[PDB]
Amino acid sequence: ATFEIVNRCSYTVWAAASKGDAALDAGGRQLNSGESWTINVEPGTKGGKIWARTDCYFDDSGRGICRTGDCGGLLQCKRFGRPPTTLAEFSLNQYGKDYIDISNIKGFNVPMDFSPTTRGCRGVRCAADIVGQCPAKLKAPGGGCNDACTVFQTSEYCCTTGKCGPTEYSRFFKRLCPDAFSYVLDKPTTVTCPGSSNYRVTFCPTA
Numbered sequence: 001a002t003f004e005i006v007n008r009c010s011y012t013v014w015a016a017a018s019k020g021d022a023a024l025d026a027g028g029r030q031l032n033s034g035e036s037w038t039i040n041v042e043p044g045t046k047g048g049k050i051w052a053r054t055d056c057y058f059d060d061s062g063r064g065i066c067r068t069g070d071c072g073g074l075l076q077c078k079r080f081g082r083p084p085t086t087l088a089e090f091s092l093n094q095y096g097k098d099y100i101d102i103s104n105i106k107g108f109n110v111p112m113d114f115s116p117t118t119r120g121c122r123g124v125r126c127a128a129d130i131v132g133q134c135p136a137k138l139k140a141p142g143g144g145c146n147d148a149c150t151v152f153q154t155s156e157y158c159c160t161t162g163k164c165g166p167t168e169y170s171r172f173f174k175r176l177c178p179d180a181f182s183y184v185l186d187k188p189t190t191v192t193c194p195g196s197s198n199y200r201v202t203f204c205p206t207a
Contacts, residue, residue, distance in 0.1 A: 001041045001092055002198045004117065005050060007031035009204035013052035013110060016069060016077040019045055027076035028053070031203075043093045043196060050088040050201050051081055052110040054143055067142040068109035083107040084144030086126060086180075088114040088201045098193040102126045103181040104173040108134075109144035113205035121193035126177035127206045135172055147173075159184035 005015045012032050017024035017039055025039035031052075041048060053069035062075040069081035084107025090100045101124060102114055108130040115123025134145035148169035149158040156164050163185075166174070170183035179189050 002038055003041055004036055004038045004200040006036045006202045008202055013203055014056045016053055016071055016081055017050045018077045018080055019048045020080055023078045024048055027078055046091045048090050051085040052203050054109055068144045083150045084109045084140050084146045086110055086112050093195050096195050098195055098197050099190050101190040105147055105181050107145055107147040110203050113202040115200055116193050116197045117200050118197045121191050124179045124191055126180040128176040130176050
């Protein structure tokens with residue numbers, strides 16, 4: 001499957017793509033404002049994620065740091081990134097279909113659209129100004145808006161026991177972005193797409 005990753009933000013981002021225990025394609029790349037990077041993701045990839053990283057530094061060997069979304073200091077990510085990270089999430093070729101969503105469960109750093117470029121379904125978007133409107137207790141001093149599990153480490157926010165409800169913090173993310181997951185047991189906003197669809201992830205889709 002191809003994923004076209006497009007940075008429409010006015011700032012550079014370092015895109016990342018991983019399934020948690022491995023890179024997808026090269027795992028990460030710099031995207032200046034307006035640049036597009038197309039990756040190939042193996043069919044059947046389960047639990048894949050794409051995100052943006054901000055304010056990164058890397059040396060000539062590809063090691064360094066990002067202020068949001070850092071994946072163990074690597075330019076080419078092979079693990080998931082440090083919150084806060086808006087997440088494009090997908091599982092491909094699962095019994096004939098693909099499944100896509102956007103999640104704020106790991107916080108928000110950059111607005112995003114995640115849409116098919118092929119027929120048969122609809123995209124999802126979280127492009128409100130969540131960082132500007134972020135509750136004071138969730139603001140990440142490094143940049144971004146953390147989720148409440150990251151900040152407070154409770155069973156209720158992290159849904160550790162499997163039985164959590166919405167919270168004042170999850171409801172903030174859900175009010176600003178109704179079509180993204182705001183907590184683990186949110187009513188799902190997953191879209192079913194034809195198996196083997198192709199996609200575009202656009203950072204900062206609106207102005």
